[PDB]
Amino acid sequence: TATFHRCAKDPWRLPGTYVVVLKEETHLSQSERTARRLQAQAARRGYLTKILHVFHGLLPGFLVKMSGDLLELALKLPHVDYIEEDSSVFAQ
Amino acid sequence: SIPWNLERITPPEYQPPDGGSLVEVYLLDTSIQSDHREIEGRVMVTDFENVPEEDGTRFHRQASKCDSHGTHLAGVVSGRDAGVAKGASMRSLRVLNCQGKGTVSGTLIGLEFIRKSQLVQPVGPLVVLLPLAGGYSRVLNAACQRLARAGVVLVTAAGNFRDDACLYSPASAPEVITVGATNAQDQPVTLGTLGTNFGRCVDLFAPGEDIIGASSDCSTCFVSQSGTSQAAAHVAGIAAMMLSAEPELTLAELRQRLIHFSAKDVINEAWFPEDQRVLTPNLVAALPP
């Protein structure tokens, strides 16, 4: 049931960077291992990935710079709740 | 004798001299001119910065321009002369670049930094001001909902798109206090061809047109600004004052106090689209007596 989401305002999308959100009680050690498993699976398919940040405290997960071609693979990772493409915010 | 907005939030000169002193207000915004006389010593600049690169290869990063938005908002909250809660301490995080643009990921990392900071060195009640908006974001809404559930009060701008606030984030997060903007005639603010957002995701309105506040052009300069960011900053200041007077308030109780003390039925609902009139709260924020 892991799903993908991207901004409905197409000019505000920031393709190429994704927030992988894990299930509520996922521990930091499990988030780090899931990020490393994504990098390894992506490399077996010939893709580079960069883990920009690993989240813990409010939402477990990580921020990854990678091709969106890897999204079907990433949604099958352990603990994944959903994946969102990064997008812009503006001063009001 | 007094800025219109400070008179408007006073129940019928600006009196409270050290309001909101038990509360810490976190500001996720542009860089700030921390030595401006209006906010010097009141705002502590954290080491946090997560911003996208400016658009245009020949951008000039002038400090007066880069710091404009954040400096004015810090002044509205706690400014020496023109602030709402003159005793509230502020902590600033930089998530908007010189053009006022940020990312949902940078905002998420910033919200995490606030929670980590609190766990390491707890102080009194916290109020987080998010004077920013993007499209509806499941992840940004979830992060705000989790920080609110952890006991932190979040206040955000409704957005300046003359549209339903439910289509934007963090405006659409129900656990966040979402603030629209009204003017000196208590009417919704027009901003060019757009203006304040409205609808069921807005909790209340607050002064947001021609708001005097600190200008980053010089250390003693003041300038008027308009927008839902300024309206949200008024509610962050009012919340800091209510929480400092009654520190045991839960988020639900605080929301009830904001509604109870607001001026009611002063907005002409004809400005909003027909179907949004019954869904938009006709409330303009005010301090308790």
**Cβ-Cβ contacts under 8 Å, A89 against chain B:** 95-96, 101-104, 107, 132-134
Q: Is residue B129 part of a domain?
A: yes
Beta strand B153-157 pairing with B177-182: parallel
- Report the half-sphere exposure of A29 (CA within 13 A, side-chain side): 0
Rounded to a whole number, what is the distance in Å from the CA of B80 to chain A's nearest CA?
23
User: From residue B104, how far is each of A22, B50, B65 by CA, in Å?
Assistant: 17, 10, 23
3-state SS class at B34: coil
User: From residue B37, how far is each of B12, B180, B197, B217 by CA, in Å?
Assistant: 30, 29, 33, 12
Rounded to a whole number, what is the distance in Å from the CA of B160 to chain A's nearest CA?
6
Contact A82, A5 (CB under 8 A): yes
The two three-digit tokens of residue A91, written as one number = 């001063």
CA angle at residue A51 from A45 to A52, to 5 degrees? 145
Q: Is residue B166 part of a domain?
A: yes
Compute the distance between CA of residue B102 and CA of residue B105 in angstroms, rounded to an integer.
9
Best of A52, A55, A85, A89 to disrupt the B interface by mutation (most B CBs within 10 Å)? Answer: A89
Residues in a beta bridge with B206: B181
The two three-digit tokens of residue B273, written as one number = 């689209």
* For chain B, the helix, strand and coil percentages under 3-state DSSP, each to the nearest 5: 30, 25, 45
The two three-digit tokens of residue B130, written as one number = 């998010």
Compute the distance between CA of residue B25 and CA of residue B227 in angstroms, rounded to an integer.
20
Cis peptide before B170 (omega within 30 of 0): yes
The set of catalytic residues of B is 29, 69, 229
In this complex, the residue of A19, A52, A56 whose CB is nearest that of residue B139 is A19
The two three-digit tokens of residue B243, written as one number = 């929480």
Compute the distance between CA of residue B98 and CA of residue B55 in angstroms, rounded to an integer.
10
Contact A82 B138 (CB under 8 A): yes
What resolution in angstroms does the PDB record give?
1.4
Amino acid letter for position B186: D
Compute the distance between CA of residue B39 and CA of residue B86 in angstroms, rounded to an integer.
10
CB contact burial A5-41 (16+ within 10 A = b; e otherwise): bbbeeeebebeebbbbbbeeebeeeebeebbeebbeb
**Sign, Cα dihedral of A76, B112, B256, B132:** negative
Longest dimension (CA), chain B: 52
Q: What is the 3-state secondary structure (H, E, C) of B138-188?
A: HHHHHHHHHHHHCCCEEEEECCCECCEHHHEECCCCCCCEEEEEECCCCCE
Judged by a CB distance cut-off of 8 A, whether residue A90 touches chain B is: yes
3-state SS class at B108: helix
What residue numbers bound the domain in which B223 lies?
4-284
Q: How many CB pairs under 8 A join A and B?
A: 107
Q: Is residue B258 part of a domain?
A: yes
Instruction: Residue B228: name the closest of B212, B243, B208, B242 by CA.
Output: B208
The two three-digit tokens of residue B287, written as one number = 């301090």
Contact B52 A88 (CB under 8 A): yes
Instruction: Residue B141: name the closest of B167, B113, B163 by CA.
Output: B167
- Report the half-sphere exposure of B94 (CA within 13 A, side-chain side): 22
**Sign, Cα dihedral of B202, B206, B212, B216:** negative
3-state SS class at B9: coil
Judged by a CB distance cut-off of 8 A, whether residue A82 touches chain B is: yes
The two three-digit tokens of residue B261, written as one number = 């003390």
The two three-digit tokens of residue A29, written as one number = 């050690």
Judged by a CB distance cut-off of 8 A, whether residue A88 touches chain B is: yes
Contact B115 A57 (CB under 8 A): yes
Compute the distance between CA of residue B61 and CA of residue B28 in angstroms, rounded to an integer.
19
Contact B104, B132 (CB under 8 A): no
Question: Per the structure, how many domains does chain B have?
Answer: 1
Contact B105 A90 (CB under 8 A): no
Contact B229 A92 (CB under 8 A): yes
**Cβ-Cβ contacts under 8 Å, A63 against chain B:** 105, 108-109
- Helix (H) or strand (E) segment spanning residue B205: strand B204-207
Compute the distance between CA of residue A28 and CA of residue A24 in angstroms, rounded to an integer.
11
The CATH number assigned to the domain holding B64 equals 3.40.50.200
- Report the half-sphere exposure of B62 (CA within 13 A, side-chain side): 8
Instruction: Residue B15: name the closest of B254, B280, B289 by CA.
Output: B289
Judged by a CB distance cut-off of 8 A, whether residue A20 touches chain B is: no
- Helix (H) or strand (E) segment spanning residue B263: strand B263-264
Query: Given the structure tokens 């291992």, which residue do they identify?
Result: A33
Q: DSSP secondary-structure letter at B53?
A: P
**Cβ-Cβ contacts under 8 Å, B93 against chain A:** none
Neighbour tally for B7: CB within 10 Å:
14
Structural domain boundaries of chain A?
1-88
Q: DSSP secondary-structure letter at A12?
A: G
Question: In A1-92, at which residue ranges do the beta strands (DSSP E only) sit?
Answer: 3-5, 13-22, 50-55, 61-65, 80-91
- Each as own residue / partner, the long-range contacts of residues A36-45 (CB below 8 Å, 24 or more positions apart, any chain) are A37/A77, A37/A78, A38/A64, A38/A66, A38/A70, A38/A73, A38/A74, A38/A77, A41/A73, A41/A77, A42/A66, A42/A70, A42/A73, A45/A70, A45/A73
Q: DSSP secondary-structure letter at B111?
A: H
Neighbour tally for B262: CB within 10 Å:
21
Rg (chain A; Cα; Å): 13
Burial of B4 (0-12, 13-18, 19+ CB in 10 A): middle
The two three-digit tokens of residue B138, written as one number = 């499941």
Rounded to a whole number, what is the distance in Å from the CA of B133 to chain A's nearest CA?
5
Q: DSSP secondary-structure letter at A23?
A: P
CA angle at residue B70 from B99 to A51, to 5 degrees? 65
**Sign, Cα dihedral of B29, B217, B225, B42:** positive
- Rounded to 10°, the helix B138-149/B104-120 angle is 10
Amino acid letter for position A83: I
Compute the distance between CA of residue B11 and CA of residue B264 in angstroms, rounded to an integer.
12
Residue B197 makes CB contacts below 8 A (sequence gap 6+) with B158, B159, B160, B161, B162, B163, B164, B165, B168, B171, B180, B228
Q: Is residue B289 part of a domain?
A: no
- Solving technique: X-ray
Contact B117, B220 (CB under 8 A): no
